[PDB]
């Protein structure tokens, strides 16, 4: 009767930085409060979705191009945590835009 540790791995990803980092920091805080070892707030290389296209709808006009780009910021956070805290930490921390995932059984 230990309430056994399972090595949780959260994987946050979003197009926003301030709305995402907020959730990250919150996760860091709550998880700290419960007194658990963890693997950082590890941040990944931000992925730029670049789309090059002509400005004009039809061929006439000086040949002007237009970069249209969307950011993808991604954070993975490993909480070496018990079976108790999974349900407590999953229910909290939800946000429009911030795509949240959680995964376990690391091998």
């Amino acid at each position: 009767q230990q309430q056994q540790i399972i090595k949780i791995r959260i994987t946050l990803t979003s197009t926003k930085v301030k709305q995402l980092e907020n959730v990250s920091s919150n996760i860091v805080k709550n998880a700290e409060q419960h007194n658990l070892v963890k693997k950082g707030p590890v941040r990944l290389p931000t992925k730029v979705l670049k789309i090059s296209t002509r400005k004009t709808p039809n061929g006439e006009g000086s040949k002007t191009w237009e970069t249209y780009e969307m950011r993808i910021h991604k954070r993975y956070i490993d909480l070496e945590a018990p079976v108790q805290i999974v349900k407590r930490i999953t229910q909290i921390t939800i946000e429009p835009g911030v795509d949240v995932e959680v995964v376990v059984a690391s091998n």
């Binding site: 000086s62 040949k63 002007t64 191009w65």
Partner: protein, 71 residues
Amino acid sequence: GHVSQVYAIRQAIAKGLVAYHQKYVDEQSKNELKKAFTSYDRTLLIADSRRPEPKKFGGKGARSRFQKSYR
């Protein structure tokens, strides 16, 4: 590339040496080293601050543009 790599390695050798002197030897020696290097400076200690400017549309390169006709 090759030249660039060479430049990097020499720089590393320099900085590594001066830093080593700074920590594990007296300062005067390090000063002597600097002054020997910095007088000659081929980006010896300090890095080369030029970095590739981006390519822009209506041309093969950055400042280069395509040829126009009129007729």
